[PDB]
Amino acid sequence: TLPHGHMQTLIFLDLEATGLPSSRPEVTELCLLAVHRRALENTSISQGHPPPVPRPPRVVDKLSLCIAPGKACSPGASEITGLSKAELEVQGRQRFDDNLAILLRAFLQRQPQPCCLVAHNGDRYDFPLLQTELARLSTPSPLDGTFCVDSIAALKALEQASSPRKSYSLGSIYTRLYWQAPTDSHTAEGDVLTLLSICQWKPQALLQWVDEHARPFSTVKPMYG
DNA sequence: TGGCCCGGGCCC
Ligand SMILES: [Mg+2]
Ligand SMILES: [Mg+2]
């Protein structure tokens, strides 16, 4: 029933780009939360209604990077992300170069395999967008052995199983489960910490869903190119 | 830009 066995490391991912898929967007900010599967299943059972926001696991590897793009941000993008191509170049931020791929490669190697990526609406944005950026580089994709899932498809499965329309956006799910508001929205590290929290709602059930719906990242159709 | 889900908004 398990195609790739039990995922030993769940790396939560969020991307910030210059615009929408029609804009041919480029990654402006990148964040990764490497969390071991035991660090997740150590999270205590959610008690009371509403249940409190679960604290992040103590043993966690974190990587947040700001990347200067090649094209300017869209009016809507720079508005919500708080990022701009002009300011990034001003602060000497480097492009999405091969040196960044090497950084990602070493960061991923320090994590036990098999490893799975978790992104909100990643199957249709974050994973295809990241797939394109790595394709631009002559350096081989460091994710040829890495797997990935969508937390939107996950949360939809966990909500219908617990409670036999409904908004499944990152902001909506977080508030619906904890009766609170996400801190620092539309920031790479701000959304992953939010993503981790809505994933720590029912960890055992989450890990159970991930191992079944885990698919190779090398099968994700690129956004463009 | 491609799939969801009661063909037009979801979901940077
Ligand atoms: Mg996202
Ligand atoms: Mg985001």
Residue A205: how many other CB atoms lie within 10 Å: 14
User: Which residues of A participate in the annotated binding site for Mg(2+)?
Assistant: 14, 16, 191
Residue A80 and residue A185 in contact, taking contact as beta carbons nearer than 8 Å: yes
Round to whole Å and give the CA distance between A133 and A93. 16
Round to whole Å and give the CA distance between A73 and A75. 7
Q: Please tell me the number of Cα atoms within 13 Å of A208 on its side-chain side.
A: 8
The residues pairing with A32 across neighbouring beta strands, listed in sequence order, are A13, A63
Residue pointed to by tokens 């939107």: A152
Which residue in A52, A140, A136, A38 sits closest to A95, CA to CA?
A136
Pairing of strands A27-36, A115-119: unpaired
- Exposed / middle / buried, residue A53 (Cβ in 10 Å: 0-12, 13-18, 19+): middle
Cβ within 8 Å of residue A104, ≥6 positions away? A142
Helix (H, G, I), strand (E, B) or coil at A35: strand
Q: Please tell me the number of Cα atoms within 13 Å of A11 on its side-chain side.
A: 27
Helix extents (H) in A42-169:
75-81, 85-90, 98-109, 126-136, 151-162
Helix (H, G, I), strand (E, B) or coil at A122: helix
- What was the elucidation method? X-ray
Nearest nucleotide over every DNA/RNA strand to the A171 CA, judged by C1': B11
Amino acid identity, residue A10?
A: L
Cβ within 8 Å of residue A125, ≥6 positions away? A15, A21, A119, A223
Q: Tell me which DSSP letter residue A42 carries.
A: T
Q: What is the token pair recorded at A128?
A: 């295809």
What is the whole-number distance in angstroms between the Cα of residue A186 and the centre of ligand 2? 5
Q: What resolution in angstrom units was achieved for this structure?
A: 3.4
Pairing of strands A9-17, A115-119: parallel
> Which ligand is nearest the CA of A28, by number?
2
Go through the domains of chain A in sequence order and give each one's CATH number: 6-220 (3.30.420.10)
Round to whole Å and give the CA distance between A117 and A9. 9
Residue nearest to nucleotide B2 (CA to C1'): A124
Helix (H, G, I), strand (E, B) or coil at A184: coil
A213 is catalytic: no
Residue A151 and residue A127 in contact, taking contact as beta carbons nearer than 8 Å: no
Q: Say how far A217 CA is from B8 C1', in Å.
A: 31
Residue A39 and residue A112 in contact, taking contact as beta carbons nearer than 8 Å: no
Cβ within 8 Å of residue A86, ≥6 positions away? A72
- Exposed / middle / buried, residue A9 (Cβ in 10 Å: 0-12, 13-18, 19+): buried
